[PDB]
Ligand binder design. Structure first.
Ligand SMILES: Nc1ncnc2c1ncn2[C@@H]1O[C@H](COP(=O)(O)OP(=O)(O)O)[C@@H](O)[C@H]1O
Ligand SMILES: Nc1ncnc2c1ncn2[C@@H]1O[C@H](COP(=O)(O)OP(=O)(O)O)[C@@H](O)[C@H]1O
Ligand SMILES: Nc1ncnc2c1ncn2[C@@H]1O[C@H](COP(=O)(O)OP(=O)(O)O)[C@@H](O)[C@H]1O
Ligand SMILES: [Mg+2]
Ligand SMILES: [Mg+2]
Ligand SMILES: [Mg+2]
Lengths: 371, 367, 371
């Protein structure tokens, strides 16, 4: 009847119907299992919890993310998450509507192939399609030219597009993302005597990072100000009532996005990666790419990230270039919105891989490019 | 036919049938034997007395508690007490019904094993099960989350439970209990010239403690008030008609629960133990445990104990926490009530260790 | 004149002079105070006891460890222990020689800063330096490449080093150590009817653990053998003359090192932690790290721990890898020996933080990396 749009990013599922302005179902991509003792199957004791229900009882659970660095590693947990999305969150039969899924570029083929297998075997989905997230972000933005930097929980990637034409050879991928920043914050908080070792404490640290961290315009100046003043400190209340205080850490955790060497990686920063991706393109393309820099994803939601982005790109690029960072207030859902647009186009209706095609052709048809 | 629920705590047996709101049989766990001369076996002279019958004739008897600090030490006396419970108090064949017994955590394995041996050898019980008392107290309370402090005559223990899931690594046990308080009161009463040396006099002192003692909100203020006034004194009549007067002792005996150093123990108080047990749990569990503190047992029946409990826990915990002490009027029987609930659940019927299982597997199946 | 080397680990002080093969002063890091009654200040009644003197009279004392999980919590007791080390055990003025102290990685900054404050204020030490223990262990071992697992009373940590170059981003820390094992043994001994509640009884249980415990090669097989035989039981005589008998507990207490869930911790075992730390390193580093596994500390002194270590690491690693566990007979003092080597190098003489530097720069200079 109506197409389903589902952005299953690392640690977050956003699912809804095509034509809507926002998905109904937004929940963490986690599976929690009891910790301290075996499950009493005789009583009404559950052996697993999914999403917000797992978050509510995380104090006695071990939490796992089935998607890691954009690649699904535990397929049973992925099946359970999909089942809960379809029958518990969206109140819809999967066998009633076609599905549009999202994936990061430069992923292993088997990941997509097995995903299709599930979507056609466990669930009797009529038709399905998998799209790249950055293309959907540019679709949501409303332009046909631009270079998209999409950063989530597991994967950061840069994709340029000119006049609606893809540039596959300039796509760049980096494994630094929000989960690495959360781990780095857990490491750094031990300097003030705060210990977080478990997965629930990891969720607490992720909340702290989302609520207090920000990007500094100049790292050295901000470090000097934090060392010579107390105006940078902020307080946070723990679930048990204890209060912690945080200082320069607020701008040291996201600084890893521009200096990956903080966590021991040889790669360059996001600004350098964007500049290098632009310098791949033909000399007649670079100016429009400079004028159109598009951000999407949760990891781009740090305050001040756009200003630092534009400053760094202006430093790298010649002085005669227009440089614009486009950071909409609704970056987090941008990809989903793009899907909701793409599934609503009548010109997209040829993209649907029907069950005749999957059965006759096999898994390889998931790598087709109809266009 | 109908399950039997029996809470055999140190110095008190509470036995009844499952589904009832209270046990029929509540009596002391004592065995009394004649003191001054050998028993005239020729005449109708009994050589031993059990329970209330021993209490009635305690003036010529030496009294013994077969259970000490939650561990059975005299098995013949335990057998006699069980026999009197089954054939004299409850008027029921043990070989007719299954049995649910209670035990304190962190007890020696052999204690349970031998108990099972008795319940399957001397008495031909069809099936039996042993449960932890704090879990039964939480079952009686009606909640699924909370930390239970159970204190009786020999053992005090703290057990937290969250969403029905046990937390075995946070269980705490302390040997200070009502018997130690009775001994401390016997020691302290010598300051006013009152001497109690025998076991019957120990029972008298236990009655005095149960009838006059209470917990002070502030120990220093109460001591100052007692020293500067006579409004704290109370009178008590002895069995022979003599009258004694008691003062600050009324709140000094239970104060040992919060200051064990009064009796030479290095451990911390019950409030500190509860706080430490809570600080073991995961940071996402502690708030619900703060909101649910459950008391059970006779030693928690002192007036004002809940107020001092909440005040101390509020002092230790952060200011943003909800702290509640739940002290029902029927704490003394709470454990038993929990058993009466647990034995009545159809989901519990898989727990019964039948005689096939005990005979085929051996003692280890009790664990 | 001659540098002083002092390894003040949780519950044990090992102090001596640089250039020696072993410290003179080895004694517990405890402070004991009278229990049952107030101290008669009129008579010659002491109010506190330190080290072996506290151990001799522990029957009437309450004992405290000023260092807990590698972090100093009672600074007055630490000051008293340092004073007794300097003026009673080593017969040396602190204001005569420079000092080299040891610390675990990922500790709070304030701990080190206050330590320096004491070493420069209460004692007029000319110069001082704080070093990581695992680096000193590798220095003592004599190699330049290897991954060190150091486990003591409060902290276990893994540090890899390649060609003398540090790898700070692969350092791992765990709070499970010998004190937790002693507490677990105290818990487990109640199954046989043995009760130990006080601190002196804790010392007795620690002696029992040091004297009778061992690591089993296969836990399930050893449990089956102990259940089906009496050859595993051992006897121990208490100070009052009573004799206790111990069975499978001998190998159940150290098994917590490989299965932390025995005490309710979500973390992995020491073998899994070592494997994960190795899998951080670059693919060109891992083989040498496999060939060089170095153990140090008291908690690594259990018989059979090296065999279980090598078996587990062989199980985790590929079959083509050389895997070696290096467990010298003198692991307990290894860190100290490393210090005695490091303080004797002429190239180390630039490391000394002199009083000019501390006074002019302040506490922050304790975090400097001269190198
Ligand atoms: N306001 C915020 N500031 C900083 N980081 C955020 C914020 N909101 C979300 N994040 C981070 O974004 C990451 C993933 O978000 P998102 O990209 O929306 O989902 P997914 O990665 O599953 O596609 C999370 O790890 C989270 O920590
Ligand atoms: N009203 C009371 N006030 C103070 N203590 C009491 C009171 N009633 C009973 N006790 C004490 O409780 C102790 C044991 O009671 P209980 O816990 O019910 O039985 P058991 O310990 O055998 O399980 C006795 O030593 C008794 O002194
Ligand atoms: N032979 C042994 N077997 C098992 N454990 C030991 C042995 N010797 C010492 N230990 C343990 O090592 C722990 C600390 O020793 P060590 O690491 O040398 O000192 P520190 O931890 O203070 O640096 C103690 O808790 C002790 O129980
Ligand atoms: Mg995303
Ligand atoms: Mg009781
Ligand atoms: Mg050590």
């Amino acid at each position: 009847t109506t197409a389903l749009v589902c952005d299953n990013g690392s640690g977050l599922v956003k699912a809804g119907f095509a034509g809507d302005d926002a998905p109904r179902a937004v929940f963490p991509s986690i599976v929690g299992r009891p910790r301290h003792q075996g499950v009493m199957v005789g009583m009404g004791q559950k052996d697993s919890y999914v999403g917000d229900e797992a978050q509510s009882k995380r104090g006695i659970l071990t939490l796992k993310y089935p998607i890691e660095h954009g690649i699904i590693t535990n397929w049973d947990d992925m099946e359970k998450i999909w089942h809960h999305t379809f029958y518990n969150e969206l109140r819809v039969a999967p066998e009633e509507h076609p599905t549009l899924l999202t994936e990061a570029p430069l992923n292993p083929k088997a990941n997509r192939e097995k995903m299709t297998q599930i979507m056609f075997e466990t669930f009797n989905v009529p038709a399905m399609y998998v799209a790249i997230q950055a293309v959907l972000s540019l679709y949501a933005s409303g332009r046909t030219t631009g270079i998209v930097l999409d950063s989530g929980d597991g994967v950061t990637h840069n994709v340029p597009i000119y006049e609606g034409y893809a540039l596959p050879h300039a796509i760049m991928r980096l494994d630094l993302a929000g989960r690495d920043l959360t781990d780095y914050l857990m490491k750094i908080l031990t300097e003030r005597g705060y210990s977080f070792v478990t997965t629930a404490e990891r969720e607490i640290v992720r909340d702290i990072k989302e609520k207090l961290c920000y990007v500094a315009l100049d790292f050295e100046n901000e470090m000097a100000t934090a060392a010579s003043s107390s105006s940078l400190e902020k307080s946070y209340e723990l679930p048990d009532g204890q209060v912690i205080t945080i200082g320069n850490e607020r701008f040291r955790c996201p600084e890893t996005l521009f200096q990956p060497s903080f966590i021991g990686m040889e790669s360059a920063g996001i600004h350098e990666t964007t500049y290098n991706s632009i310098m791949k393109c033909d000399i007649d393309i670079r100016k429009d790419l400079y004028a159109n820099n598009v951000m999407s994803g949760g990891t781009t939601m740090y305050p001040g990230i756009a200003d630092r982005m534009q400053k760094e790109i202006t430093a790298l690029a010649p002085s005669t270039m227009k440089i614009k960072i486009i950071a909409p207030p609704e970056r987090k859902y941008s990809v989903w919105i793009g899907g909701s647009i793409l599934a609503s186009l009548s010109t997209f209706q040829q993209m649907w891989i029907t069950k005749q095609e999957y059965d006759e052709a096999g898994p390889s048809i998931v790598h087709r490019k109809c266009f």
